[PDB]
């Protein structure tokens, strides 16, 4: 779980 | 030392005898890395990613300094859109989440009771988000439509401006964005009202 929101 | 959020948490890291620049990213369990090469032993991995699993590869054990501090762990290489530091190595340099402006460890997922339709839901904290985006709900008011990337793509969502949220008993307003994803997502947009801070 790599969140991450650009 | 205090790393607020207003801006993206970026820093310089070594990495094999590499300076790159990194996001401190709560929202990350680990640590991944666009395209390098590294010295070590790696094992194929698969993880995340909008619309299906992005596959990495593993390097167990490498040496990492962060801040001025070394941490010695796991890094994942492959197709991110930016360098991401995860908790695996942000424990290492011993970063907590705090009310700078409540200790909340980073062992785990920072997740938090958040209410927002006047209702309640569990979001995570993540610095390396800038907006908040929020599982598929309905939200009285106007919203256009945007799109938003991570690892893996982009996602189309619904932009909602001035809307209240509570976090941990502080109130936030601003923008949230509505759309399908496995979990909700406190951004910087929202940390930053409530006074939120990197702190090691």
């Given at each position: 779980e790599t969140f991450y929101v650009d | 030392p205090q790393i607020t959020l207003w801006k993206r948490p970026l820093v310089t890291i070594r990495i094999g005898g590499?300076?790159?620049?990194?996001?401190?990213?709560?929202?990350?369990?680990?640590?991944?890395?666009?395209?390098?090469?590294?010295?070590?032993?790696?094992?194929?991995?698969?993880?995340?990613?909008?619309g299906g699993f992005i596959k990495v590869r593993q390097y167990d054990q490498i040496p990492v300094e962060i801040l001025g501090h070394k941490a010695i762990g796991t890094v994942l290489v492959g197709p991110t859109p930016?360098?991401?530091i995860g908790?695996?190595?942000?424990?290492?340099?011993?970063?907590?989440?705090?009310?700078?402006?409540?200790?909340?460890?980073?062992?785990?997922?920072?997740?938090?009771?958040?209410?927002?339709?006047?209702?309640?839901?569990?979001?995570?904290?993540?610095t390396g988000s800038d907006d908040t985006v929020?599982?598929?709900?309905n939200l009285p008011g106007k919203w256009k439509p945007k799109m938003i990337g991570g690892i893996g793509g982009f996602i189309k969502v619904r932009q909602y401006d001035q809307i209240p949220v509570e976090i941990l008993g502080?109130?936030?307003?601003?923008?949230?964005?509505?759309?399908?994803?496995?979990?909700?997502?406190?951004?910087?947009?929202?940390?930053?009202?409530?006074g939120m801070t990197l702190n090691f």
């Open positions: - | 590499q300076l790159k620049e990194a996001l401190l990213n709560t929202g990350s369990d680990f640590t991944v890395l666009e395209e390098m090469n590294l010295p070590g032993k790696w094992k194929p991995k698969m993880i995340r990613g909008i930016v360098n991401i908790r695996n190595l942000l424990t290492q340099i011993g970063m907590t989440l705090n009310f700078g402006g409540p200790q909340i460890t980073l062992w785990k997922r920072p997740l938090v009771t958040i209410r927002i339709g006047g209702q309640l839901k569990e979001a995570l904290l993540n929020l599982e598929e709900m502080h109130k936030a307003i601003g923008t949230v964005l509505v759309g399908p994803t496995p979990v909700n997502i406190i951004g910087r947009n929202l940390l930053t009202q409530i």
